[PDB]
Amino acid sequence: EVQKPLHEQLWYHGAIPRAEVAELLVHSGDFLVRESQGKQEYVLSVLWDGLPRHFIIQSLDNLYRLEGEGFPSIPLLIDHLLSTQQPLTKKSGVVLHRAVPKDKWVLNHEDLVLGEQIGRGNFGEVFSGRLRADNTLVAVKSCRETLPPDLKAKFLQEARILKQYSHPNIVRLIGVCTQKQPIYIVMELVQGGDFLTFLRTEGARLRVKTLLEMVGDAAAGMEYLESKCCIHRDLAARNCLVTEKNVLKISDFGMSREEADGVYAASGGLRQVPVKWTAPEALNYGRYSSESDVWSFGILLWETFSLGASPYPNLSNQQTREFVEKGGRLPCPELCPDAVFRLMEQCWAYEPGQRPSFSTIYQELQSIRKRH
Ligand SMILES: C[C@@H]1CN(c2cccc(Nc3nc(N[C@@H]4CCCC[C@@H]4N)c(C#N)c4cn[nH]c(=O)c34)c2)C[C@H](C)O1
């Protein structure tokens, strides 16, 4: 193990952000080695006094050192530090205890070949791609480095959330490319593309039973997320994907948050918030919950039965907020069955407590589908 090159080491995390480093180091003396992207130097990061401390690994004459003896490799230096329990510096008194290994999701850049751009996300371009070992087709999310540091720190959040999930109607994570820059999140490629485009393109061809089945799939995904205490915050037709077999999967988890007690209080600082899909209390007071996702689901129902129409077309975001406060809601689409519209109206109840649960939504849609 110690003989292996640094890049192969389990405790070498390459280009992971400082914010990810803080997540990984749990106990005193927990440590990892990484490459500092800015300075192009290796860094030993260690938890001491409750906070990560970052030591620059010096290199001279092909020997790696801190303030003591030098070694011909960084793994030999780490082994010396761990085995002797010598403080990394006399001044700091930091002593290594446990090497924090990469998880199973970390992926090498070499494993992946990037293809054509397939869309644009808030963090940057999404590309199609290929895993070289088996020809598995993937979607690859990128993060533009010119984004503000506060926001870039949020990019890996979607991967951290999705690592936990497995469901037929939730997009599947494949891995995270964080050993070098540029950083990528890698997911299964969903062949049919986004649901909004599907609705607009397939259009008059789609049967009501088919639409009910697809939104039923979305309700199943949302029920599963609610069960995991996940609040998606960006549910919309454009953020649902369609498989080659017309199964719908929820995707685009960049804004999603896990809250044990069911409420996420927004920073207030979000840019490009999808105002037309967002519940009033979430905009007004920053209160996000499964109930605010339910409001979004009502908009998704509207998008589905209007075959991809844009909501509140004649209103600005601010005008939409004012319109909704006055009791305004979207009109019933022609193709929308009366029962679906009644459910849609319940989803848009002003008080979040009055809105139906995702289980109720799934069951009601399923029951409607059986008579269509
Ligand atoms: C011509 C067709 C077009 N296709 C096509 C067209 C649109 C989207 C996608 N796919 C994905 N889009 C995502 N975000 C998009 C951002 C921009 C708006 C739409 C989406 N919201 C995400 C995310 N997060 C994912 C995540 N995981 N997996 C995916 O596939 C995926 C494929 C692929 C197909 C093979 O070629």
Curated annotation (Swiss-Prot):
Effect recorded for residue 294 to M: Strongly reduced autophosphorylation and kinase activity
Effect after changing residue 14 to V: Abolishes kinase activity
Tissue-by-tissue expression: Widely expressed. Detected in adult colon epithelium (at protein level). Expressed in melanocytes (at protein level).
Resulting phenotype, residue 255 to V: Reduced autophosphorylation and strongly reduced kinase activity
Processing and modification events after translation: Autophosphorylated on Tyr-264. Phosphorylated by LYN in response to FCER1 activation. Phosphorylated by HCK.
Occurrences of domain SH2 (ranges): 11-100
Residue intervals of the Protein kinase domain: 112-372
Compartments, as annotated in UniProt: Cytoplasm, Cytosol; Cytoplasm, Cytoskeleton; Cell membrane; Cytoplasmic vesicle
Binding site for ATP: 118-126, 141
Catalytic center residues: 234 (proton acceptor)
Modified residues (Phosphoserine): 267
Effect listed in the UniProt record for changing residue 141 to E: Abolishes kinase activity. Fails to inhibit proliferation of melanoma cells
Phosphotyrosine carried by residues: 264
Subunit structure: Homooligomer. Interacts with BCR. Interacts (when activated, via coiled coil domain) with TRIM28. Interacts (via SH2 domain) with phosphorylated EZR, MS4A2/FCER1B and HCLS1/HS1. Interacts with phosphorylated KIT. Interacts with FLT3. Interacts (via F-BAR domain) with soluble tubulin. Interacts (via SH2 domain) with microtubules.
Illness association: Has been shown to act as proto-oncogene in some types of cancer, possibly due to abnormal activation of the kinase. Has been shown to act as tumor suppressor in other types of cancer. Expressed and present as activated kinase in a subset of acute myeloid leukemia patients; promotes survival of leukemia cells. Expression is absent in K562 leukemia cells; ectopic expression of FSP/FES restores myeloid differentiation. May function as tumor suppressor in colorectal cancer; expression is reduced or absent in samples from some colon cancer patients.
Function, as annotated: Tyrosine-protein kinase that acts downstream of cell surface receptors and plays a role in the regulation of the actin cytoskeleton, microtubule assembly, cell attachment and cell spreading. Plays a role in FCER1 (high affinity immunoglobulin epsilon receptor)-mediated signaling in mast cells. Acts down-stream of the activated FCER1 receptor and the mast/stem cell growth factor receptor KIT. Plays a role in the regulation of mast cell degranulation. Plays a role in the regulation of cell differentiation and promotes neurite outgrowth in response to NGF signaling.
Similarity comment: family membership: Belongs to the protein kinase superfamily. Tyr protein kinase family. Fes/fps subfamily.
Free-text domain note: The coiled coil domains are important for regulating the kinase activity. They mediate homooligomerization and probably also interaction with other proteins.
Note: Cellular homolog of retroviral oncogenes. In contrast to the viral oncoproteins, the kinase activity of cellular FSP/FES is tightly regulated, and the kinase is inactive in normal cells in the absence of activating stimuli.
UniProt protein name: Tyrosine-protein kinase Fes/Fps
Species this chain originates from: Homo sapiens
Interval of the full protein contained in this chain: 450 to 821 of 822
